[PDB]
Amino acid sequence: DLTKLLIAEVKSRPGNSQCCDCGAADPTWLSTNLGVLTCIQCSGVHRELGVRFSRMQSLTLDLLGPSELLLALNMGNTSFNEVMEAQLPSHGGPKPSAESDMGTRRDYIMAKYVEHRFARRCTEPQRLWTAICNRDLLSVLEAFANGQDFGQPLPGPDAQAPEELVLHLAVKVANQASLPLVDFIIQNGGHLDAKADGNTALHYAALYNQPDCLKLLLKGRALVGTVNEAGETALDIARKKHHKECEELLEQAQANKEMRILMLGLDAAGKTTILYKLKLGQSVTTIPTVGFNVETVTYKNVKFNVWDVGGQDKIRPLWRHYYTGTQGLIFVVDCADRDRIDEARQELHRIINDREMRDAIILIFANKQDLPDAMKPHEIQEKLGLTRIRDRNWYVQPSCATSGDGLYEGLTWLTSNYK
Numbered sequence: 367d368l369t370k371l372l373i374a375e376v377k378s379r380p381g382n383s384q385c386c387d388c389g390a391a392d393p394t395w396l397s398t399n400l401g402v403l404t405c406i407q408c409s410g411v412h413r414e415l416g417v418r419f420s421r422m423q424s425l426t427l428d429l430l431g432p433s434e435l436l437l438a439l440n441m442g443n444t445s446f447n448e449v450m451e452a453q454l455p456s457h458g459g460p461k462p463s464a465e466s467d468m469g470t471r472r473d474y475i476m477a478k479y480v481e482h483r484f485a486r487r488c489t490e491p492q493r494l495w496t497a498i499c500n501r502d503l504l505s506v507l508e509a510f511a512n513g514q515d516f517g518q519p520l521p522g523p524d525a526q527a528p529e530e531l532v533l534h535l536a537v538k539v540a541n542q543a544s545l546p547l548v549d550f551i552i553q554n555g556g557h558l559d560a561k562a563d564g565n566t567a568l569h570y571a572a573l574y575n576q577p578d579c580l581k582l583l584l585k586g587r588a589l590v591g592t593v594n595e596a597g598e599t600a601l602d603i604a605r606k607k608h609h610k611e612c613e614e615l616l617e618q619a620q621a622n623k624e625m626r627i628l629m630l631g632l633d634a635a636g637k638t639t640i641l642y643k644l645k646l647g648q649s650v651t652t653i654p655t656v657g658f659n660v661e662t663v664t665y666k667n668v669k670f671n672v673w674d675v676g677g678q679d680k681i682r683p684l685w686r687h688y689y690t691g692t693q694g695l696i697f698v699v700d701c702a703d704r705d706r707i708d709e710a711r712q713e714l715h716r717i718i719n720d721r722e723m724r725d726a727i728i729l730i731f732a733n734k735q736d737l738p739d740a741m742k743p744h745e746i747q748e749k750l751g752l753t754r755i756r757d758r759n760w761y762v763q764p765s766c767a768t769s770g771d772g773l774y775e776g777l778t779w780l781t782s783n784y785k
């Protein structure tokens with residue numbers, strides 16, 4: 367309603383009437399941390415790269431707020447590709463089109479966003495610092511594309527006795543216009559809970575009166591009450607410099623043998639991925655499933671009627687329909703997606719508490735264990751709020767759909783606990 371406008375404005379950016387990676391008919395899929403638009407076909411490869419590189423939401427199918435659309439309105443395809451496809455020629459270009467071979471698409475998108483082949487080239491410490499205060503997002507992107515690593519600090523101007531890291535600075539010298547860079551930095555190389563006199567990026571926001579910066583920092587879910595050399599928390603500095611507005615948000619910062627399986631979870635969790643590796647034995651490439659999938663897995667003399675339903679924000683209220691006559695629940699959780707865990711917490715708890723769902727076996731796949739910072743199964747139990755789940759039969763199973771690891775074991779548990 368308030369966002370309808372912003373969506374419409376995102377689409378009308380230069381180059382956004384074509385897919386970022388294959389230039390297809392007006393794309394609906396946003397890589398929220400890059401502010402770019404891809405078709406449903408290119409979209410799936412981003413989901414393959416992980417939330418570490420790309421965070422896909424549909425403008426059409428996911429539920430989006432003003433806050434998530436910041437870079438989208440301030441980036442768009444043309445601006446982005448100007449940097450990232452700078453060394454791409456016109457003729458014989460490796461960049462694909464509308465309906466190209468998945469192999470060719472995949473090979474290109476992986477080289478572009480992860481390896482950064484086609485992006486403009488150079489080194490470089492100070493130029494970044496200059497771009498930040500200049501608020502030149504496009505140059506910051508250039509830096510990011512050449513492999514800058516925002517985690518490590520840069521020397522500053524005259525009498526440079528101390529040393530500050532990228533994000534810390536961007537916050538200090540920020541206003542309304544300075545925002546998207548703050549957001550880009552957080553979502554792309556931002557070691558959010560970094561310290562360096564041991565002041566957090568959170569602390570700084572309270573020192574220089576940066577209300578909108580505080581908003582973005584907690585959106586990325588940040589540490590509160592961490593102490594520095596003075597023994598000051600985020601709340602504490604806001605009082606010493608008496609910056610009124612910030613303190614309001616910091617106070618809120620606290621509070622024979624067959625079986626029908628329903629397989630749910632948030633978008634991009636790996637639901638389809640799991641289902642088809644189990645059914646085919648080989649791993650397959652996956653487009654986001656706009657409807658749902660049904661296949662029958664016959665592992666160890668037991669028929670599994672698996673119902674893989676897509677989990678875009680808009681297509682979740684349809685889950686209710688698949689509850690009736692279900693025995694086992696497979697909730698797939700993307701573990702690399704540390705940001706959307708309380709979302710999965712909520713959506714699982716919304717299911718297992720449905721009055722049409724008590725007599726359900728619950729198997730949680732703690733999927734994507736192969737990815738870098740993965741977040742372990744024990745850590746999943748606690749965060750998914752299974753500590754106080756009693757008189758319910760749950761079981762978290764470490765898995766990696768791409769390789770196949772952990773998957774059959776989950777079934778084994780279903781067989782066994784279908785007593």
Ligand SMILES: Nc1nc2c(ncn2[C@@H]2O[C@H](COP(=O)(O)OP(=O)(O)O)[C@@H](O)[C@H]2O)c(=O)[nH]1
Nearest residue numbers: 413414634635636637638639652734766767768
């Ligand atoms: N690294 C890794 N990637 C995975 C794993 N499972 C799924 N993926 C990727 O995540 C993306 C989303 O999978 P998908 O089944 O379409 O998610 P769905 O929307 O819940 O059905 C796919 O591109 C997969 O390549 C995993 O265990 N490890």
Ligand SMILES: [Ca+2]
Nearest residue numbers: 423428429679
């Ligand atoms: Ca969402």
Ligand SMILES: [Mg+2]
Nearest residue numbers: 637638655676
């Ligand atoms: Mg799916």
Ligand SMILES: [Zn+2]
Nearest residue numbers: 385388405408
């Ligand atoms: Zn495309």
